[PDB]
Write a protein that binds this ligand. Structure first.
Ligand SMILES: Cc1cccc(-c2ccc([C@@H]3[C@@H](CO)N4CCCCN(S(=O)(=O)c5nccn5C)C[C@@H]34)cc2)c1C
Lengths: 959, 12
């Protein structure tokens, strides 16, 4: 009947717990479409995936596909305002982004459910009549260069592109993907190329409707959603572009039996073992790569990782199938290297082929496939409700790979047990096919090659045939047994009935000297899952740097101890998180509630009766030292945030302080630390999910009784439960802390306009002003001025205080960015006075929609509560309370707030700035808007003296 | 740890 629709998909199989409505379509022009009707969703969303990516980049214009991705946002024929897309979304509680892989370009947005169409119309125009304005082209090319510049000093990106540089250079795999100013402007303007033509030429060539997939999720009916998609997208022209495919592998014979010695930027020691394999995508129901990844990557008793760990050679192992484009895949094994493991790489690789040989000797195991099949089956049935933005983006990508009806299940459910494919893949994992990469600072100065795009220092060697042969004659190693039946797989998925006295927010069901137990039985999601969060308080976890180091190492050793045992539970959807905090320890247990108390007890017993393996202690301590040192190579803007956190917190130990004190951490001193840490505690816990009140009370009591028994834990005094305060900046003051980043050749800056203690009033003044400036700050400071790829503004909340913050990472010096952001602030003062009275209320409803967005999954709701609890504020109805007040704010209230707190001449201005200089930046002192003249900043020369000379804020009264 | 299967992003 309808001619714009080539077909409609029969029922789209979904989880029986998924209340959303689905319909599959293929438009006349060949666009595969999935429509999602959720009358609940507070935000609607849509996404489009083009099966074109970096691999289709022209050889002479590296990165064109990624650059074009940036350019669709900046103006259409029907919506030619450069930022009409960003502006429309920002004014309607929306967000958007996109990425570019080798074979895909993925665009997605979300917006208030009442404006899906308006957003979708502006969005669809991306693929119909993009302007590619010559002025915006010359500006946005800098954003791409900042993005690459960011990644140049990143160890992961360097390895990523080093592999591409290592294979067949004729293969598209070797293409530089990111793009930068050289390949997108300098070199083209050198070769006479009109880039706007090549952007138009490419878009018109590859952005065909036959290579497109669309997902739209909104409150609208499935029929209404069908009409909408047909209305806006059926006019995309079908150029019948043949889908690019790459049968020939990027690694041929001459690229096998090769070894690479690579110099990293951080101090890391890693070993990568890779095998070229055929594309396993088609076998999505047999899934042989996962079967082998599951066994080879296993961390339980009898596993490869175990023996490598026991011999002190490796600490972590990751294995499985790595994606390449259509027609070629990889199999990777990734181990980090201890100081010893670096010297026994030959043996480590041998041990790898010994385990692989075991897998060949045992043959395919149907029970293993059954276990994997059953776990995925459960996982899909009780899948968590996704956020609309990420859900449309992911579905939009896999519409290209599976039938309309299988699109939801294809990546989860298993069907065929294929022992032939298991042997077929397993046969490609052989020493003649292997490629070895070693990453260690120990190759410093010993490299004879340089990777052109990132500068990576490396040396290429052929693996001796004598060594290949050793690997081929791999005996069976009696230390490698297959795993056993996973006893942690859940069997009881019964949702307990909702108790009479249940509450909508967490109830304080225990307030003893040792425990403060917050509890809420789930009344929204009804999945067999629960979240168990515990905060352990001890003044001895952060009393001084030495004790912080031991707090860390204690838990790192403890987790190391349990890993073998706990790994099974993780595969079974029962995971735990355990880490030291500036107040003590944090333990969270999330997953299926069935086997949950068994794991929780094993943890607390291990905590209270922990016995340290000295060999593990020395190895973890060494990795910890490198972890600290390796912070010198982090992004400049993260340095900025790091420093400011040190500057404004009452107590805070710097990395250097920790690093210096780490040598004094002997095994004896650690053994003494642990029982002292556990001797006096206060536990504040949130138990939330599919559990009853007395199950929770029993959980909490069991945790206590275990500690009391084995660690003789007494309570802490209420006066010991002191939280840290934030430094109180003086009226009209401006302080500047300056540091250099010795690794990255960009600079970073954070600017913090401290306002006042958190309050229902002061909270919303800030949040509303931050909303009004959110999009403009990005549009002015990045899109126009192109200060850098990373440009962020928004609230900063810490220790009960708050304020406005800007974060920029740029090539320009920090003191320059200071003026440009200062200039931008005056731009807003006018922008508000001229801003219409409706546009003001527009921003209010936008914030309101965001603040009231209902959590979709249990974990997300638990986080809301857990924030209220660790912040000592316990404002569980905060969203209704604070949004209500927000709506009464007037355009005048915000101007008084700005003139009094934020303006350059504000009476109560509180400005502290962190300047992180680039690696080579000398020690620093048109059509643009006017920057105001700034006072002389007081330069923090010493952080300890800075805090001594300033007051400390109070702490927010709770409730 | 089994890992199964970058991508260059538009925005910070
Ligand atoms: C010259 C040469 C020879 C042999 C291998 C390599 C090589 C190839 C690829 C890598 C990638 C690099 C980014 O591309 N990294 C990210 C950090 C660790 C994660 N992993 S992963 O765990 O192995 C992995 N991802 C998907 C599946 N799995 C198992 C990928 C690894 C690293 C090294 C090289 C460069």
């Amino acid at each position: 009947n309808n001619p714009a629709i080539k077909r409609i998909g029969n029922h789209i199989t979904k989880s029986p717990e998924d209340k959303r409505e689905y319909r599959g379509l293929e438009l006349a022009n060949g666009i595969k479409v999935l429509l999602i009707s959720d009358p609940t969703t507070d935000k609607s969303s849509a996404a489009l995936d083009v099966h074109i990516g970096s691999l289709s980049d022209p050889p002479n214009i590296a990165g064109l596909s990624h650059f074009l991705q940036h350019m669709l946002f900046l103006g259409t024929k029907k919506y030619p305002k450069e930022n009409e897309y960003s502006q429309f979304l920002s004014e309607h509680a929306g967000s958007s982004n996109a990425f570019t892989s080798g074979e895909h370009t993925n665009y997605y947005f979300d917006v208030s459910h009442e404006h899906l169409e308006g957003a979708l119309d502006r969005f669809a125009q991306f693929f119909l009549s993009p302007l590619f304005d010559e002025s915006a082209k010359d500006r946005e090319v800098n954003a791409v260069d900042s993005e690459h510049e960011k990644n140049v000093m990143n160890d992961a990106w360097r390895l990523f592109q080093l592999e591409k540089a290592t294979g067949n250079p004729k293969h598209p795999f070797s293409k530089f993907g990111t793009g930068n100013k050289y390949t997108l402007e300098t070199r083209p303007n050198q070769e006479g190329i009109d880039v706007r033509q090549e952007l138009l030429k490419f878009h018109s060539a590859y952005y065909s409707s036959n290579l497109m997939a669309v997902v739209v999720l909104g409150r609208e009916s499935l029929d209404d959603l069908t009409n909408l998609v047909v209305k806006l997208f059926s006019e995309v022209e079908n150029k019948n572009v043949p889908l690019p495919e790459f049968p020939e592998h990027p690694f041929q014979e001459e690229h096998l039996k090769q070894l690479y010695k690579i110099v990293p930027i951080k101090d890391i020691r890693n070993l990568y073992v890779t095998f070229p394999i055929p594309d396993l995508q088609k076998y999505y129901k047999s899934n042989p790569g996962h079967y082998l990844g599951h066994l080879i990557g296993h961390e339980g008793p009898g596993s490869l990782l175990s023996e490598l760990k026991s011999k002190g050679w490796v600490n972590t192992l990751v294995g499985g199938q790595k994606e390449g484009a259509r027609g070629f895949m990889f199999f990777i094994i990734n181990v980090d290297l201890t100081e010893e493991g670096l010297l026994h790489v030959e043996d480590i690789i041998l041990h790898m082929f010994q385990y692989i040989q075991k897998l060949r000797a045992e043959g395919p195991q149907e029970w293993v496939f059954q276990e994997l099949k059953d776990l995925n089956a459960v996982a899909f049935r009780f899948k968590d409700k996704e956020r609309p933005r990420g859900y449309t983006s992911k579905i939009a990508g896999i519409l290209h790979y599976y039938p309309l009806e299988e699109v939801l299940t294809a990546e989860y459910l298993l069907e065929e047990f294929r022992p032939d494919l298991i042997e077929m893949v397993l046969d490609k994992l052989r020493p003649e096919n292997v490629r070895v990469a070693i990453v260690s600072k120990s190759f410093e100065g010993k490299t004879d090659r340089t990777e052109e795009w990132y500068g990576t220092q490396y040396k290429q060697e052929a693996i001796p045939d004598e060594v290949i042969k050793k690997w081929q004659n791999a005996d069976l190693n009696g230390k490698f047994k297959l795993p056993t039946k996973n006893e942690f797989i859940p069997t009881n998925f019964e949702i307990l009935p909702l108790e009479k006295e249940a509450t909508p927010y967490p109830a304080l069901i225990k307030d003893t000297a040792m425990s403060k137990l917050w509890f809420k039985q789930d009344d929204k999601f009804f999945l067999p899952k629960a979240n168990l969060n515990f905060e352990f308080f001890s003044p001895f976890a952060y009393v001084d740097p030495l004790h912080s180091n031991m707090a860390y190492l204690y838990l790192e050793l403890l987790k190391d101890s349990l890993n073998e045992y706990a790994y099974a539970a993780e595969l079974a959807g029962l995971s735990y998180d355990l880490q030291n905090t500036i107040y003590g320890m944090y333990l969270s247990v999330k997953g299926y509630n069935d086997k949950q108390p068994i794991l929780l007890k094993k943890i607390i017993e291990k905590m209270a009766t922990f016995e340290i393996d000295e060999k593990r202690f020395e190895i973890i301590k060494e990795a910890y030292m490198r972890s600290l040192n390796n912070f010198r190579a982090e992004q400049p803007h993260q340095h900025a945030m790091y420093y400011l956190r040190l500057l404004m917190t009452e107590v805070a130990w710097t990395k250097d302080e920790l690093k210096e004190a780490l040598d004094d951490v002997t095994l004896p001193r650690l053994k003494a630390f642990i029982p002292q840490l556990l001797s006096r505690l206060h536990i504040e816990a949130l138990l939330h999910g599919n559990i009853t009140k007395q199950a929770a009370l029993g959980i909490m009591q069991m945790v206590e009784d275990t500690l009391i028994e084995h660690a003789h834990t007494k309570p802490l005094l209420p006066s010991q439960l002191v939280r840290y305060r934030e430094v109180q900046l003086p009226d009209r003051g401006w302080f500047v802390y300056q540091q250099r980043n010795e690794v990255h050749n960009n600079s970073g800056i954070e600017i913090y306009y401290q306002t006042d203690m958190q309050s229902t009033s002061e909270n919303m003044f800030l949040e509303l002003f931050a909303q009004i400036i959110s999009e403009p700050a990005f549009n002015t400071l990045r899109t126009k001025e192109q200060l850098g790829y990373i440009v962020f503004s928004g609230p900063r909340r810490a220790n009960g205080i708050q304020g406005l913050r800007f974060i920029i990472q740029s090539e320009k010096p920090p003191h320059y960015l200071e003026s440009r952001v200062e200039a931008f602030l005056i731009t807003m003062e006018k922008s508000i006075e001229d801003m219409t009275e409706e546009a003001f209320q527009k921003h209010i409803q936008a914030l309101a929609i965001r603040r009231l967005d209902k959590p979709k999954k249990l974990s997300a709701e638990s986080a809301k509560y857990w924030g209220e609890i660790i912040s000592q504020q316990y404002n569980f109805d905060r969203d209704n309370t604070e949004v209500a007040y927000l709506k009464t704010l007037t355009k005048e209230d915000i101007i008084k707030f700005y003139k009094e707190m934020l303006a350059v001449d504000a009476p109560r201005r509180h400005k502290v700035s962190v300047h992180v200089l680039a690696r080579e930046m000398d020690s620093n002192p048109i059509n643009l808007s006017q920057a105001p003249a700034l006072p002389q900043p007081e330069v923090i020369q010493n952080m300890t003296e800075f805090k001594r000379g300033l007051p400390l804020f109070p702490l927010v009264k709770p409730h | 740890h089994s890992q199964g299967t970058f991508v260059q992003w538009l925005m910070n």
